[PDB]
Structures are given as structure tokens and as C-alpha cells.
Amino acid sequence: KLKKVLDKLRLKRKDISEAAETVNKVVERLLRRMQKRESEFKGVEQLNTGSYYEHVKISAPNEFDVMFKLEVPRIELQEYYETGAFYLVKFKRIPRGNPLSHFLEGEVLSATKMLSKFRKIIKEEVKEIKDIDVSVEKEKPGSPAVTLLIRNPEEISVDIILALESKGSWPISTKEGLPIQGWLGTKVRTNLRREPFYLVPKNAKDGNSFQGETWRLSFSHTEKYILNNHGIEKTCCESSGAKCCRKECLKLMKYLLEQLKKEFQELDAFCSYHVKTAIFHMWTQDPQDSQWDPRNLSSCFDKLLAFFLECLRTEKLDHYFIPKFNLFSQELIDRKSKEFLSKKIEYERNNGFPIFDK
Amino acid sequence: MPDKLKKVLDKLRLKRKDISEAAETVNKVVERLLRRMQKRESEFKGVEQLNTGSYYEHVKISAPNEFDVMFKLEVPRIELQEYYETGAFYLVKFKRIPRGNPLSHFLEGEVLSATKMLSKFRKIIKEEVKEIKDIDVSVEKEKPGSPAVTLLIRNPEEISVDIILALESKGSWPISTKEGLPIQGWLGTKVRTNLRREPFYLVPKNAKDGNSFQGETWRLSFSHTEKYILNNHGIEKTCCESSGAKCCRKECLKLMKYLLEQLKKEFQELDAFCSYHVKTAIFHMWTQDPQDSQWDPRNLSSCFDKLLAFFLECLRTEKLDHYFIPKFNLFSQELIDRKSKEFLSKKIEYERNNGFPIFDK
DNA sequence: AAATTGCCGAAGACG
DNA sequence: CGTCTTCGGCAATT
DNA sequence: AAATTGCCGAAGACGAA
DNA sequence: TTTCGTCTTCGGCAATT
Ligand SMILES: [Zn+2]
Ligand SMILES: [Zn+2]
């Protein structure tokens, strides 16, 4: 039953091959143009992130996320006051010249000014691409990305994400996040927290104070690693180990939310990251690979469903990396909307998931 | 018995006071030697340090009185030539220009002389040790088969420090290792692949039995990989971590090392055997029995017994494959006479059959 | 660049 | 069995 | 130095017993 | 049936030229 849904969601190699060929061509051209053109972004490097690169993209390979990350030495973060997720970026005392000086709006780094120049560079190179049908999508509120729309002829979206990279210890709001000690272990946690951290523009258009200078933490790199290294046993899903159903449960939950969001505008405020965050908590709660045996896919999916519903009921879904940041706060999603989603999930759960049959 | 093995482990356990005092002195001497070699105008200026062996693996028993340290020198653009299909032994040649590389005076042909390099390495170390006035330390006379310059420190307690000369190469490992490191069902394929992307090391064979190419033969060293495995030894990521379960893998290795050490002290016919034979055997046993549950501390006696049984079968069949170089038989007739292996079998059998009287000190 | 700095896991020491 | 402590390893940073 | 090279893990494609 | 084994391609990483 769920097995057939998973077969339907599984990507086809031909599609993957055709999509990746084009995406890689465009992205490499844009990355290299950025690295060579005289600008503040000369030093960008690429990190592929998101569902496709985590092997959990469903149905079609038509969405690609790519970070163009820029190391920014000697920064000092100022927490956007209550929120452990949002920050203003200031600079420690400079030796002989900050090359991001043109982007300073006060003492603070302007995400809006940096993004405008970044966007300008991408657009000017995209105009020169004559061998692929690609355009830059008009800027969207709340997005840290320059989005490309490719017609291959099939529609493919590529989010080029501007990120600042900082190699120091992670912000203190993350100190009690990443609770993987009983699952992936303390060596893994310590190693993950020695990798850099990333800030991307919040880019909200709400007109709130500091809107052009507010940055958001991103842990897409850590999430990617975890998805590829997700078992308590080192051999989980490897060629000399046992397959688990962890990723399959995530695919199913994303599909459920995707189908619901398709026909209910009441669910605009919900997104796949809510589901991803929920399953990370579930992987922490149930760390043993044997709790994710393929033979128990049905019960595993139901357990995840129950957990998500309880998050909705209690209006609490802690960010996995920033515990004090509630993705289900009233301020973020109205109490009315969570109740709506609960009802819908409860329906599908109690009626054999009809929405899975399109 | 369970009681005796527990008491033996208690006795073998190092004391923190002893550790602190030994490390303090060792660290001072090694740092001084490393900096001297890096600061001076010598062929060895780029050396970097890697601590290895039992102490740094947390399996040194009884006293913190033996320290191994590699001074590793990167050698870009070399070509290896396997010496007599041994798989463990190599001649080293240089690819090309600029021919203003160091080590040019170490060539005995197009072939890098281990003996010439080791002599200069030893000469530099000896000169600096002569200037050490705050610690009682001397350089031990060269020993056959050693890749190390050995220091003897009196702290006042005797401490030996092996300073090992190693060449570092960052390319893929020699082909003789291709089917070695059989950890795929235990530590896994990502771990194996990542470990085989670390550099490989060559150290002087430094034999003195007069064979051809004696001064130019190098042998592969996997001490860095072994150290990693010892600190990362569980099928579960949480093995022996603060939020995981303690296993008895290292404790079994301690017991077997102690057994061999005690037998070696009273029987000189066991001269051919060494702790590496024990280490190699247990790496195989960890591959054979990969589950952390197969190394539960409550089953210490049975775990030690299975390792003994496995070692005895290696002895009987005269075959103990190098864990990293499968075709290299540590228990071959050429390396260890048949009579010596039969003698050790009888002794281990006797100890096992009698509940380890030799452990009664 | 050398070498100080910060962190935290491993395992001995201590209620 | 828990919690404290010190040594070691790694790399960001000055 | 920027970018080719080489490896091999993850997982899709597919025939077999 | 479900699922090995085999073959395959795409991507991550870094040593190298
Ligand atoms: Zn798995
Ligand atoms: Zn363990």
C-alpha cells in the first residue's frame, strides 16, 4: 500500500540525468562567472543542499537548491532580540579594509544591498545563456534566493542561495540544539559543530524594523550530513548493512503535506521544513535502527503522524538546532490553521489516505 | 576466572598521577625535538607530529612508560616499487624536476636510502638531546629492525620514547592493501573509504641481516589508521560514549597483551612474538564479531576466551594475515619458526586450561 | 606562517 | 552508577 | 591556480531464481 | 510474490597538475 506510493514517488534515472545535466551546466557557468568577475563575491564557493541532494526529493527532479557561500572573517553577531534564529551582522575592528564596506548600512551588514548586487550579477550572466531556456524569477518576499526557472522543456526551479560562512563556534542559541547524543553520538555532534555555520538573508517584506539587515541561521549543510549518516549503526543503509525506512517515512510525510497544500489554501503557512523538523525529533526519540525497519513502515509512518499531530495540538515544534525557536508559535502560524491541518491529517489517517491516489 | 580478570585489569589500569608526570616530561622533550627539527636548516624542516601506539590508543598497560611518536615528512611525487611481492615492503623513487628537492643526498641511485635519511635524522636528534639539561635523557643505541630513534628518559622512572621517521604520501594506498581493512560489515563503507583517503606512511624496515637493498627498503605503517579504529571501534556510533554503552574490546586487548608479555618474560623461545601479533588477531576478531553486544563487559571472560581460541587457531594453521595487507602472513615459516608457534600454543593452552596462573604475578 | 586558543571526548578519581 | 578532572587532538585565529 | 582526476557510496534499472 | 546480485550514473571530496 505505502510501498506503491513510494514507488510512485521514486525518481526515474532518465529524468534525473536530463535535469542534472542542464542544472549543472547553468550553475557552473553562474558560479564561475561570479568567481571571476571583479566584485565582492569573487570568493563564493558552492554547496548543494535540500531535498534532491539529500535523496528525499519526490515525484520529479524539478527543484534544486544551491548555496553560494561567502566566508566572512571577523564578524560579530547581534541576536535579533528574542529570536535565537535571527541576527544582525556587525564587524570586529578591521585591520586594513572590509571589502563588504559598500554593503554596510550603519555598522550593520545590509542583506538587502548584498542580495541586490548578487542578484544583479546572476541576472546579467543569465541574459547571456543562449543554449538553455532560463530566466530569473522576480524577487519573492521572505526568500534568501535568486530563483532560476528552466524549461528543459520541463519546468525546473533552481534556488541560488546567498550565504555568509563563519568558521567560529556556533551562536549560543544553538548550544542545546542538535540533540543527537544518544543517536549519532557525541563525537559526531562535536565534529558537526566544528563545521562552519551559515547566515542567509531573512529578506522579509513586512516593513518591520531592520528588515533589510536581518539574517537567519541555516543548517542545511548539517541536515544534509545527517540524512546521509542517519543510523545509530555505521552500516545503516550501506552495502554491507541493513536498509532502514527513515528516509521513506520522510518522503511519505512530505507527500501528504504537499497533496494537502495543493488543494487547501488554508495551509499556506505550512512547509516541508516543518515535516523535516518533526522527523529529526522522531529520529532522536527513536534512535535504534531497528525502530525503523522496512517491515514496520506502516507503524513507523503512523508514529511520525501521531507526533506531528501532537506538535500541532500543543502549538509547539522546536527548531532542531535552535531549541527556543518555536516553528509553531502563534506569531508564525495562527491557531486556526493548525487545527485545520490536524483535522485534515486525522481524516486521511482514519480513511486509508485517499489523497495518496491523487 | 571473572574475578581474576577483573583484578588483573585493576592492576593494569594506569594511574592519573603517573600519567601526568610522564606526559609532562615526554611532551617537553618531544616538543623541543620537533621544533629543533623544524626551525633548523635541514632536510627535515617540514616534519609534522602524530602520536601513535598503545598509550595514545588508551591500551598501554601497567605504567605510562612507553610513548610512540611519528615525525612524518611529506614526500610529493614519489613512485613506489614493491620489493619481492611482499606487499609490505617497498623501494621509493622520485618522479621529476625541480631536482632541487631535499633528500637528493639521500639517494643511493634513483632510490631513496632509508639508512642515509635515518642517520641524519638520528644525528639531528642526538645533537639536540645533548643540549637538554633539565631532564635526564639519552638516545638509545640503534636496534635492528627499528624505524625509530629511541630516547631513554629517567623521570626518575624509566620511560622510552620512540621517535619514528615516516614518509607521508597523500595518494591512493598501494594495491597490496586493496582487499585489506575488512571493516565493511563492522565500521562500514563510508568509514573504510574515508580511512583510505587519509595518507599512507612508509618507515624504514632497517633490517640488518645483509639482504639486498637493506638500506633502501621501506615498509608500510598503518599506525594512524589503527589509532582511529581503536578510538572509533563500535558498530554503534555511541559505543563507549557518555550517552552510549561501554564495551570490553579494549579490555580484551589489554588482557591478551599482558598474557603475551608475561609469557615472553619467562620464555625466551617466544622472542619472535610481539604485541602487534595480538593487535592484528583482535582486529580480525572485531571483524568476525562486529556487534557491540558481542563485547558486553558482563561477558569479559567469554570474550577473552574467544580471542584466545582464535589466536590458537592462527598458530595451529600458521597463518595470521596482516589486517591491512591480506597476502602478508605474520605467522609464516620465514618470519617465525614452526617450533616457536607450537611452543606458544602449548603455553597459551596451559594458561587457558588452568585459569591463568601466570596472572597470579 | 608559528604557535596560542577553545572545545570537549576518554577514561581515571571520587562521592 | 554519576559527576568531576586532566590529557590529548584538532583547527580557527592572531 | 582553477579545475581535471579518481574513487566509491547511494540508489535507480532490471533479470533471476 | 519480494529481493538478492549486478550493473549503472550522479555527486562529494580533495589530491593533483
Ligand atoms: Zn538507514
Ligand atoms: Zn566500545
Question: Your description of this structure?
Answer:
It is classed as transferase/dna. Keywords: immune response, TRANSFERASE-DNA complex. Two copies of one chain form a homodimer. With 358 residues, chain A is an alpha+beta fold. Chain A has two domains: 1-11 and 170-196 and 219-358, Poly(a)-polymerase, middle domain, CATH 1.10.1410.40; 12-169 and 197-218, 2-Layer Sandwich (Beta Polymerase, domain 2). Helices cover 36% and strands 17% of the residues of chain A. In chain A, helix 1 packs across helix 6 and helix 8 packs antiparallel against helix 9. The longest helix of chain A is centred in the N-terminal third of the chain and has 24 residues, at 13-36. The interface between A and B is medium-sized, with 17 and 17 residues. One zinc ion binds next to loops of chain A.
Summarize the structure.
Two copies of one chain form a homodimer. With 358 residues, the first copy, chain A, is α+β, with helices and mostly antiparallel strands.
| Helical/strand content category of chain A | alpha+beta
What small ligands are held by the chains?
zinc ion
Along the chain, the helix and strand elements of chain A come as HHEEEEEEHEEEHEEHHHHH
Q: Roughly what percent helix of chain A? A: 25-40%
Q: What is the CATH first-level class name of the largest domain in chain A? A: Alpha Beta
Oligomer: homodimer
Corresponding CATH architecture of the largest domain in chain A = 2-Layer Sandwich
CATH-assigned fold name of the largest domain in chain A: Beta Polymerase, domain 2
Shape of chain A: globular
PDB class: transferase/dna
Keywords: immune response, TRANSFERASE-DNA complex
Assembly: hexameric
Entry title: Mouse cyclic GMP-AMP synthase (cGAS) in complex with DNA
